[PDB]
mmCIF file with all atom_site columns, C-alpha atoms in Angstrom:
data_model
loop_
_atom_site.group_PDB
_atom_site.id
_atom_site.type_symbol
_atom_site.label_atom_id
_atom_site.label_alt_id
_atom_site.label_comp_id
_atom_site.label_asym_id
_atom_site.label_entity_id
_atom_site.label_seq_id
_atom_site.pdbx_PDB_ins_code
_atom_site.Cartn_x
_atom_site.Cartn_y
_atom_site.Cartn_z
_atom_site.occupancy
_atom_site.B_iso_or_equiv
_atom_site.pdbx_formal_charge
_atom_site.auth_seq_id
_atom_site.auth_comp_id
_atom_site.auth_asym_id
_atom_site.auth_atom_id
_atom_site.pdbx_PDB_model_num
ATOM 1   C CA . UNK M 1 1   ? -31.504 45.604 -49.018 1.00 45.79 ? 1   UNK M CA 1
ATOM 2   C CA . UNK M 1 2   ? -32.288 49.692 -49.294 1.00 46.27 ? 2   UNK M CA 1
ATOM 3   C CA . UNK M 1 3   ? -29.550 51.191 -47.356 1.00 43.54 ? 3   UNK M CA 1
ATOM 4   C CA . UNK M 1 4   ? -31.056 54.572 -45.258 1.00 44.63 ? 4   UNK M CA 1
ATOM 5   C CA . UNK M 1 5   ? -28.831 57.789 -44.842 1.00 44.58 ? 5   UNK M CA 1
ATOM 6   C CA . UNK M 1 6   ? -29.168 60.145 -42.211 1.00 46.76 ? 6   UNK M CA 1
ATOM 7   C CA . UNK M 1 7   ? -27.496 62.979 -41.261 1.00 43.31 ? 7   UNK M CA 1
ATOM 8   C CA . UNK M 1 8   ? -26.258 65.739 -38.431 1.00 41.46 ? 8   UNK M CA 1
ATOM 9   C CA . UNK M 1 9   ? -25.444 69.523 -38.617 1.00 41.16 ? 9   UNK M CA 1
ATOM 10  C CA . UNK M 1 10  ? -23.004 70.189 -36.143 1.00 39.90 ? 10  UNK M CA 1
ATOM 11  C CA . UNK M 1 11  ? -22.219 73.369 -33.429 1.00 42.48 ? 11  UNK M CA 1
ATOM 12  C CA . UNK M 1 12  ? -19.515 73.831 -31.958 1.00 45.76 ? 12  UNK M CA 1
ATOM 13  C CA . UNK M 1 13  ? -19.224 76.425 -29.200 1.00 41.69 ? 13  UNK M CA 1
ATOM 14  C CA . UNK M 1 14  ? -22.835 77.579 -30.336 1.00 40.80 ? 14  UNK M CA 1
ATOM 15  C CA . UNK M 1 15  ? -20.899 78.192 -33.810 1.00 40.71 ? 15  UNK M CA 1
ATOM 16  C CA . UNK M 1 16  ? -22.215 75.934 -37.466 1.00 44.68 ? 16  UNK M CA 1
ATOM 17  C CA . UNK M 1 17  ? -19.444 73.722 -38.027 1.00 46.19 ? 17  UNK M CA 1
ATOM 18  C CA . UNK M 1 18  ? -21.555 71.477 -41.305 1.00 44.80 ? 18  UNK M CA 1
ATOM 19  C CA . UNK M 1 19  ? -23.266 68.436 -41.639 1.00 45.16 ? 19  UNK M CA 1
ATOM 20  C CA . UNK M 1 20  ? -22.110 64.608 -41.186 1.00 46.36 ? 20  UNK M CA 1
ATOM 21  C CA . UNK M 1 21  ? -23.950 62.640 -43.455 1.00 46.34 ? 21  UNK M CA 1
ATOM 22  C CA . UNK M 1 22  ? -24.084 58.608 -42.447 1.00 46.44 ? 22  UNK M CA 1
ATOM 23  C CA . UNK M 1 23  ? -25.206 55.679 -44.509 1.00 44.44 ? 23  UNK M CA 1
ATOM 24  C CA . UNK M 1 24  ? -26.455 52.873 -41.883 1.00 44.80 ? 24  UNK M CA 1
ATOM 25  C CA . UNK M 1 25  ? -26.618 49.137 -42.757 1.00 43.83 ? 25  UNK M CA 1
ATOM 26  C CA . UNK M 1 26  ? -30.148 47.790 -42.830 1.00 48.03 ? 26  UNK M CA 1
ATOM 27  C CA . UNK M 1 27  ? -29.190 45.087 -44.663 1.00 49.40 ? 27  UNK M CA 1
ATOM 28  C CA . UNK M 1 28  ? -27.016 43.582 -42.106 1.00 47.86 ? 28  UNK M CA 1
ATOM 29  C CA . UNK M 1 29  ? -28.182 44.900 -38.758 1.00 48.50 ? 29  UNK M CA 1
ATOM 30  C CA . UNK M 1 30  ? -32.009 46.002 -39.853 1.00 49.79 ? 30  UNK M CA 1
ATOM 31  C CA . UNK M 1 31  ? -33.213 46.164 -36.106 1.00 50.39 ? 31  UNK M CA 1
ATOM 32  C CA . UNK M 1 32  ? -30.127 48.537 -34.779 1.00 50.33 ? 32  UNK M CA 1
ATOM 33  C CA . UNK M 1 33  ? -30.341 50.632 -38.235 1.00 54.06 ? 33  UNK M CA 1
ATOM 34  C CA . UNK M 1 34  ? -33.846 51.116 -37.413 1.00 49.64 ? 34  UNK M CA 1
ATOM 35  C CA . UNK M 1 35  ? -33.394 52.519 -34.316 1.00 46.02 ? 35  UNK M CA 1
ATOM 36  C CA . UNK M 1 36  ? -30.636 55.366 -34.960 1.00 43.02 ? 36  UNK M CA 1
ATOM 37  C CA . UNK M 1 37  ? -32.895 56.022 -37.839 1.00 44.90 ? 37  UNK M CA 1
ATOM 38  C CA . UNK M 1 38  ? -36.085 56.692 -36.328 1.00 46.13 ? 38  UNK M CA 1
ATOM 39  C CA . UNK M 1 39  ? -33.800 58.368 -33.593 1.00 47.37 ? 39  UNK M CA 1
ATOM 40  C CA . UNK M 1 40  ? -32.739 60.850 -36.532 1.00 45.59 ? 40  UNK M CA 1
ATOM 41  C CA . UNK M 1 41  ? -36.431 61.528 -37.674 1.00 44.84 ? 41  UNK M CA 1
ATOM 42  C CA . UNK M 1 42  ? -37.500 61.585 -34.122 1.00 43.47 ? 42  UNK M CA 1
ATOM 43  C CA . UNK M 1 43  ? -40.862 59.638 -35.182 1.00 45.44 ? 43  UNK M CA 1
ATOM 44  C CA . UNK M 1 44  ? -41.955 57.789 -32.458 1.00 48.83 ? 44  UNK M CA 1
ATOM 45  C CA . UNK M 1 45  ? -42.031 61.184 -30.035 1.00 49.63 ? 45  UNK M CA 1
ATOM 46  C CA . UNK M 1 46  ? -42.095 60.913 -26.326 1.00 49.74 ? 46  UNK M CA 1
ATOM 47  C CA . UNK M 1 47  ? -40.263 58.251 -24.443 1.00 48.68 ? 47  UNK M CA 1
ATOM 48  C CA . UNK M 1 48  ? -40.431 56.466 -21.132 1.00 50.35 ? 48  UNK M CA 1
ATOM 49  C CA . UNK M 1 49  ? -38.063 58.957 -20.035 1.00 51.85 ? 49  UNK M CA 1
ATOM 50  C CA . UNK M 1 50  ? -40.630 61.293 -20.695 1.00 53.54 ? 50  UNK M CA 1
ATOM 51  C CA . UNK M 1 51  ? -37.626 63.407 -22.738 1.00 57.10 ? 51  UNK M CA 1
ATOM 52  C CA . UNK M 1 52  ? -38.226 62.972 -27.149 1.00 55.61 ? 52  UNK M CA 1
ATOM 53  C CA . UNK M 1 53  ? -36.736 59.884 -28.525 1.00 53.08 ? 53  UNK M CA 1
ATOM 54  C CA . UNK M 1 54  ? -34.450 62.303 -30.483 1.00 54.11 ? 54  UNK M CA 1
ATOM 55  C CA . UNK M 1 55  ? -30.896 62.993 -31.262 1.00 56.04 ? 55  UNK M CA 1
ATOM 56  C CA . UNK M 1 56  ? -31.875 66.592 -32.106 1.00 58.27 ? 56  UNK M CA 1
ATOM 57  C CA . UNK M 1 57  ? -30.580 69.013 -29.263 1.00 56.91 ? 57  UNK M CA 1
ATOM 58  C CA . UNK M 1 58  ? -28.195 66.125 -27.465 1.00 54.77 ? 58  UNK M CA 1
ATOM 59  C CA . UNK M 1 59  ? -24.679 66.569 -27.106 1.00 54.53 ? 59  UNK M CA 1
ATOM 60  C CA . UNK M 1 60  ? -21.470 64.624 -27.811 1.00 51.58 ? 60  UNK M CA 1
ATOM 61  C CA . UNK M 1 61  ? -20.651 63.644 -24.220 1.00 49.48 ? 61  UNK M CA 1
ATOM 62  C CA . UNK M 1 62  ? -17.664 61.922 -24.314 1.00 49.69 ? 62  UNK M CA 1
ATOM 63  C CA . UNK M 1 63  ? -14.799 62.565 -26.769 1.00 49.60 ? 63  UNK M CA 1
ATOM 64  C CA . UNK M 1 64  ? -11.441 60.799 -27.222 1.00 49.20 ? 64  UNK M CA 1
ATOM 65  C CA . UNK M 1 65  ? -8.819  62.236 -28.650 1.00 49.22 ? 65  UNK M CA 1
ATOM 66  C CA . UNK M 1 66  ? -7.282  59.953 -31.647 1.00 47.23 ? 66  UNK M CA 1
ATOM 67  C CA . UNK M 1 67  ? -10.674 57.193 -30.904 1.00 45.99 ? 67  UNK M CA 1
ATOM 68  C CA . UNK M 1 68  ? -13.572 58.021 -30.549 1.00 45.44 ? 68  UNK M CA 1
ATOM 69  C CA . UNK M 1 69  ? -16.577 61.175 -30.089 1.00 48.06 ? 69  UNK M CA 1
ATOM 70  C CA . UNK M 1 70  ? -19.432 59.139 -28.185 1.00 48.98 ? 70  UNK M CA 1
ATOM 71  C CA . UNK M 1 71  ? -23.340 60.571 -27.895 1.00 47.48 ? 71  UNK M CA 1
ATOM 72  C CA . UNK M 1 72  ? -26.717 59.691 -27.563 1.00 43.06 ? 72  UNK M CA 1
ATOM 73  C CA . UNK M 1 73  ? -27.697 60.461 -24.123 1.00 43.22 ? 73  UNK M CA 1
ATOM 74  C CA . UNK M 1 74  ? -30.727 62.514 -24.587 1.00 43.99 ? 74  UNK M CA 1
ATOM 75  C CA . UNK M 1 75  ? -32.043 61.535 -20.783 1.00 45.62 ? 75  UNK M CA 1
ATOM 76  C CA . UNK M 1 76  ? -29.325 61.988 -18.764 1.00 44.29 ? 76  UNK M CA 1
ATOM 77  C CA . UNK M 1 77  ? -26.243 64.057 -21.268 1.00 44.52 ? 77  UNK M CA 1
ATOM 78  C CA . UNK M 1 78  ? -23.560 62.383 -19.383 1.00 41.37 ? 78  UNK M CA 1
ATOM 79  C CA . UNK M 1 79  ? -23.330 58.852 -20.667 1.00 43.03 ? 79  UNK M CA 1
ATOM 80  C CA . UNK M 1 80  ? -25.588 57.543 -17.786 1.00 43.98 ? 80  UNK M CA 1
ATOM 81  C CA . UNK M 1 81  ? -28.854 57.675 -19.475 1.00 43.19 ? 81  UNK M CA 1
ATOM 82  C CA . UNK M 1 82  ? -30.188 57.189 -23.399 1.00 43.02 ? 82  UNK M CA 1
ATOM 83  C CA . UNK M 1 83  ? -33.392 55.329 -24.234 1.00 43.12 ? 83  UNK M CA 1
ATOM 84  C CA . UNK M 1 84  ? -33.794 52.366 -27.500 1.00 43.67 ? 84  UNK M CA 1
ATOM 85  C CA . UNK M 1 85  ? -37.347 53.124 -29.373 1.00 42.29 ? 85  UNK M CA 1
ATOM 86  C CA . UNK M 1 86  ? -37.747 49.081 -28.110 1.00 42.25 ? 86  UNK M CA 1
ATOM 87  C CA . UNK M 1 87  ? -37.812 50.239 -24.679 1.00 44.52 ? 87  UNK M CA 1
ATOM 88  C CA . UNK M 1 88  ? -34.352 50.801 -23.097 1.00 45.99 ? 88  UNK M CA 1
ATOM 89  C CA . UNK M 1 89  ? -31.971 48.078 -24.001 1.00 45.36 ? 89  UNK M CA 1
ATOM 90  C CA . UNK M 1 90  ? -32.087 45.588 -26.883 1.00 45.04 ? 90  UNK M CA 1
ATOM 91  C CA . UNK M 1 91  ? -29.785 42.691 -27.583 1.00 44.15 ? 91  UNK M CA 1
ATOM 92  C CA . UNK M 1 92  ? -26.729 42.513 -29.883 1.00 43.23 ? 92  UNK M CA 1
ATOM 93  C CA . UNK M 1 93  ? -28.361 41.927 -33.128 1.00 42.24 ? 93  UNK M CA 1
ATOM 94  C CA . UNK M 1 94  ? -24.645 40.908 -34.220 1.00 45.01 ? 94  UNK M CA 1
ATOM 95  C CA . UNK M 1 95  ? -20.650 41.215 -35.034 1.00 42.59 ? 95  UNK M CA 1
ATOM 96  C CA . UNK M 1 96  ? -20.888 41.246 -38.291 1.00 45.48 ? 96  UNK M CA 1
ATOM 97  C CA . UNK M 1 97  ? -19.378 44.393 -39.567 1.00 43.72 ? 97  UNK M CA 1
ATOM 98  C CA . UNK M 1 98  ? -16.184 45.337 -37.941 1.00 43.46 ? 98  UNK M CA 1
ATOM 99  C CA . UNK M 1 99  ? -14.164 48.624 -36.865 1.00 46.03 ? 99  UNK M CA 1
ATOM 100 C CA . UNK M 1 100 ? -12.472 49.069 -39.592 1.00 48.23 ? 100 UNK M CA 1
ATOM 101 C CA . UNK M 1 101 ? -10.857 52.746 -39.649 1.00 47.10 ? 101 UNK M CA 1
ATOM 102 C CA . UNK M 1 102 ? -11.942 56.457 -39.130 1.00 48.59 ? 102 UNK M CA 1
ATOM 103 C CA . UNK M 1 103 ? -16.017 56.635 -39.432 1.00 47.69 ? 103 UNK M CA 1
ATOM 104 C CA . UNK M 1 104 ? -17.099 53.361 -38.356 1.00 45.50 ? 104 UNK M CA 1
ATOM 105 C CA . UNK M 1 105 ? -21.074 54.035 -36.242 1.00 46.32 ? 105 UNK M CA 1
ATOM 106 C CA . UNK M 1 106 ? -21.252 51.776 -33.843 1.00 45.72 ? 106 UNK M CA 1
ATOM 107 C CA . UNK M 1 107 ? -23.312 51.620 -30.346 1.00 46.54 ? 107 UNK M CA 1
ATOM 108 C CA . UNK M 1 108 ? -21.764 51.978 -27.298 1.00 50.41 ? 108 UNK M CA 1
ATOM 109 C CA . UNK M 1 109 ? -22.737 49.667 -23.880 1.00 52.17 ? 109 UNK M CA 1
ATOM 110 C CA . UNK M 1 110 ? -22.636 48.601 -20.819 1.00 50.31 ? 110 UNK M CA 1
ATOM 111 C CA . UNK M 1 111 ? -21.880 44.905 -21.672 1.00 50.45 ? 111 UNK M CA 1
ATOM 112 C CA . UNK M 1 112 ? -23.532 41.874 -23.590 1.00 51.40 ? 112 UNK M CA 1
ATOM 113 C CA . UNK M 1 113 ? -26.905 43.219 -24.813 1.00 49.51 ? 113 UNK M CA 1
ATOM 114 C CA . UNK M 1 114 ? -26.782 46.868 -23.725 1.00 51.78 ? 114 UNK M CA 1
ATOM 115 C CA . UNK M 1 115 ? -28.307 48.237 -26.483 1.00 54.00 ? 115 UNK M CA 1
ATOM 116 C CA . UNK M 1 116 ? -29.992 51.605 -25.992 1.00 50.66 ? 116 UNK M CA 1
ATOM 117 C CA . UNK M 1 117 ? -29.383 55.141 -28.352 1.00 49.34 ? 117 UNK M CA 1
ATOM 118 C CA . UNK M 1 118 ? -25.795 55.960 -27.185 1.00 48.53 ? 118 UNK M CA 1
ATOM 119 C CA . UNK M 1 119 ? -23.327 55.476 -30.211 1.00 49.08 ? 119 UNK M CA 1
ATOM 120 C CA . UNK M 1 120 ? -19.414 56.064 -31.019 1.00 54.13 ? 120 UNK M CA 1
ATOM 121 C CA . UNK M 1 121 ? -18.168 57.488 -34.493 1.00 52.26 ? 121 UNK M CA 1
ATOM 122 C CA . UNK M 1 122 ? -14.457 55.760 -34.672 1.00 53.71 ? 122 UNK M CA 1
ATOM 123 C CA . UNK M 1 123 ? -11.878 58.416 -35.490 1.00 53.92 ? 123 UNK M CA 1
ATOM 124 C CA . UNK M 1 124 ? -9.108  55.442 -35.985 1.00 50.52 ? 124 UNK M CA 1
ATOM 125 C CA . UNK M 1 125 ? -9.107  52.009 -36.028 1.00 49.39 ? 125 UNK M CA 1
ATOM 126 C CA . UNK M 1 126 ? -10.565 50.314 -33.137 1.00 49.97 ? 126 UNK M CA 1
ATOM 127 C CA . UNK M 1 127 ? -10.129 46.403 -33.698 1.00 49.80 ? 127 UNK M CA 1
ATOM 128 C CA . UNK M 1 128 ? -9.913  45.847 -29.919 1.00 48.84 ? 128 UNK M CA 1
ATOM 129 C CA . UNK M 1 129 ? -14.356 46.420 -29.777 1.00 50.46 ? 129 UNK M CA 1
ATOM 130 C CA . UNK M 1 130 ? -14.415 43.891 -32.669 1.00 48.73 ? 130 UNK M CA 1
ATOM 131 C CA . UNK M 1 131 ? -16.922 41.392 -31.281 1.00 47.70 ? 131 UNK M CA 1
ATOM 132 C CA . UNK M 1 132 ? -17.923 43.518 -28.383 1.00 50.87 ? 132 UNK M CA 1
ATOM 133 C CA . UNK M 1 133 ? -19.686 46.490 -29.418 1.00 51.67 ? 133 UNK M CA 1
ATOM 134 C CA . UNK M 1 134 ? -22.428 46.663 -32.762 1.00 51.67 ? 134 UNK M CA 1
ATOM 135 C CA . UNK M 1 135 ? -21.072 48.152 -35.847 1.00 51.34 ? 135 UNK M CA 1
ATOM 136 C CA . UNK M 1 136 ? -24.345 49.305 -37.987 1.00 49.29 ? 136 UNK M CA 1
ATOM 137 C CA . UNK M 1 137 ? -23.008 52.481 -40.358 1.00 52.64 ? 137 UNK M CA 1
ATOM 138 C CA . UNK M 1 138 ? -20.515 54.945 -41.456 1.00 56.55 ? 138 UNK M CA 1
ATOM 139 C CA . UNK M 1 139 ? -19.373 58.452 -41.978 1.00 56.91 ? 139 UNK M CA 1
ATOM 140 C CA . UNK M 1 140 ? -19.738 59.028 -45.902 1.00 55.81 ? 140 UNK M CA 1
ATOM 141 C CA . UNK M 1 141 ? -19.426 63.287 -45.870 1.00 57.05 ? 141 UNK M CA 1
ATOM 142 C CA . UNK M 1 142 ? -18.089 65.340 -42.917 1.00 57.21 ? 142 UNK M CA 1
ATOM 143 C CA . UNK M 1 143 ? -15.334 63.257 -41.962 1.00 51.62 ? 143 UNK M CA 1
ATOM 144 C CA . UNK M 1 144 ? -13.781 66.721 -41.461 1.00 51.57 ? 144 UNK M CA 1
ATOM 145 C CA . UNK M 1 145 ? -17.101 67.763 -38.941 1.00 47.67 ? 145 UNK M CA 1
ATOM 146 C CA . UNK M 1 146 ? -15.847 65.234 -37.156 1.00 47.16 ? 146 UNK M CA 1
ATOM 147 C CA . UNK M 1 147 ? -12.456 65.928 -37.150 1.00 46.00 ? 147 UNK M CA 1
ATOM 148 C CA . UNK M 1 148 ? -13.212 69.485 -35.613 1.00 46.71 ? 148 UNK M CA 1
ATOM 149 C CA . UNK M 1 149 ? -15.223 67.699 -32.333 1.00 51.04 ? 149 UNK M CA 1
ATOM 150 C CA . UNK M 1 150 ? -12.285 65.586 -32.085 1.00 50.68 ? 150 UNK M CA 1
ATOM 151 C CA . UNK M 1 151 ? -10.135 68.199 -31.706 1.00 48.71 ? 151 UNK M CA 1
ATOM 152 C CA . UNK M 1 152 ? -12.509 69.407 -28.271 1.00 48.12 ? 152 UNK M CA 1
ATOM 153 C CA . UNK M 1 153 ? -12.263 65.753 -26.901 1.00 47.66 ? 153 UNK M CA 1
ATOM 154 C CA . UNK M 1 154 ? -9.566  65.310 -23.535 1.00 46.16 ? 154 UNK M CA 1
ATOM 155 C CA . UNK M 1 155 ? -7.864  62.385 -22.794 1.00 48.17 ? 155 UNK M CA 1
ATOM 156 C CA . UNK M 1 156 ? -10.354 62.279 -19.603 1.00 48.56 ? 156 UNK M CA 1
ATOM 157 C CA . UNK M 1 157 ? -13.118 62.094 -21.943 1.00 48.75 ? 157 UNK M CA 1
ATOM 158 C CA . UNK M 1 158 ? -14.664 65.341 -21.192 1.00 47.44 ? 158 UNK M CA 1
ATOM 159 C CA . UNK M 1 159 ? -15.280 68.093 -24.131 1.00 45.14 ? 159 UNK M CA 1
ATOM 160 C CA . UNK M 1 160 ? -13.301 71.707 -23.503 1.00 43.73 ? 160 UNK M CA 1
ATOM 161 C CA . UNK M 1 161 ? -16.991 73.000 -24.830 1.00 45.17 ? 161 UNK M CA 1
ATOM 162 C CA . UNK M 1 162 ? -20.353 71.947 -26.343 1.00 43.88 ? 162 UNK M CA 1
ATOM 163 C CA . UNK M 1 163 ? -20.408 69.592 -29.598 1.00 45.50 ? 163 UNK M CA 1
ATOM 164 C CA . UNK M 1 164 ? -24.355 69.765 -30.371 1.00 47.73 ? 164 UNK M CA 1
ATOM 165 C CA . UNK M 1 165 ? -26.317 68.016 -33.092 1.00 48.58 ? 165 UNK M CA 1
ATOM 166 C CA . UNK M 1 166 ? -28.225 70.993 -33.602 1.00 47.81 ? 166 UNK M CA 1
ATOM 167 C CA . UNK M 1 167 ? -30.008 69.188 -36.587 1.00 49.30 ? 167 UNK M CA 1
ATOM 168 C CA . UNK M 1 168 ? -30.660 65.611 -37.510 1.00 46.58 ? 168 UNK M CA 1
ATOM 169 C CA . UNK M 1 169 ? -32.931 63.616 -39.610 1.00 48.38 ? 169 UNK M CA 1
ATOM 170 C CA . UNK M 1 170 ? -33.467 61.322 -42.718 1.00 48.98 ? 170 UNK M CA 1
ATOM 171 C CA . UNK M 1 171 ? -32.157 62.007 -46.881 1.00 46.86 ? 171 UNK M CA 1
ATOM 172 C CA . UNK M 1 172 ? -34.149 61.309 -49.121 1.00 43.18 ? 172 UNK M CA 1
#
C-alpha cells in the first residue's frame, strides 16, 4: 500500500554534509518498515535500554569501503547493542526484496531472526546477503551524503571520524 519516507541530515566531523531521504516498503515488509519508521519519528520514547528508541544523535558505526555504512546502535554505538520498538529482536518478516545495487536499506544481524534497529545502506551490489539479511527500503536523494561517509569507512570497519544522524524523522 502507502509507501512512508523518512529521512537523515548528516555530520560529518561535526560539519552539515545534507540530508538522505529513504522511501521504505510497507507494502512488502509492513512490520520491519514500521519499525525504522517509528525509529525516525522517535514515537514510542524510552526503551528497555532505558536510552530513546531513536536514530537521532546515533552514529554510523561501522563503514565499509566499496559495501556498506552500517548504524543503529543507539545503546551500545559499537554494533553490540540496538533495541526493535517490539522489544529487542523480531523475526525475518521475509526475502522478498533483494540487494540490488548502491542504496538498498536493509537490517543487519546476528543470524536467523536477529532483528533489532541496526541497519546497512548498500553502497554496491551485495547479492551474497540475498536471503540472509531483510531488505525493507532505499536511498531515493543523497546518494552523494552517502557517498561522503563512505569515503570515512576503513577496510577494518572503523570510521577515521564521526558520521552522525544529527536529524531524522518522517516527510510528509
Amino acid at each position: 500500500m502507502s509507501r512512508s519516507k523518512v529521512f537523515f541530515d548528516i555530520t560529518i566531523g561535526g560539519k552539515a554534509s545534507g540530508r538522505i531521504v529513504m522511501e521504505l516498503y510497507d507494502d512488502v515488509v509492513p512490520k520491519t518498515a514500521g519499525n525504522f519508521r517509528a525509529l525516525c519519528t522517535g514515537e514510542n520514547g524510552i526503551g528497555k535500554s532505558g536510552k530513546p528508541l531513536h536514530f537521532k544523535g546515533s552514529k554510523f558505526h561501522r563503514i565499509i569501503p566499496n559495501f556498506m555504512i552500517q548504524g543503529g546502535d543507539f545503546t551500545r554505538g559499537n554494533g553490540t547493542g540496538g533495541e526493535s520498538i517490539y522489544g529487542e529482536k523480531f523475526p525475518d518478516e521475509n526475502f522478498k526484496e533483494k540487494h540490488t545495487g548502491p542504496g538498498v536499506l536493509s537490517m543487519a544481524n546476528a543470524g536467523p531472526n536477529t532483528n533489532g534497529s541496526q541497519f546497512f545502506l548498500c553502497t554496491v551490489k551485495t547479492e551474497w546477503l540475498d536471503g540472509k539479511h531483510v531488505v525493507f527500503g532505499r536511498v531515493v536523494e543523497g546518494l552523494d551524503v552517502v557517498k561522503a561517509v563512505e569515503s570515512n569507512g576503513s577496510q577494518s570497519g572503523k570510521p577515521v571520524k564521526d558520521c552522525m544522524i544529527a536529524d531524522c524523522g518522517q516527510l510528509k
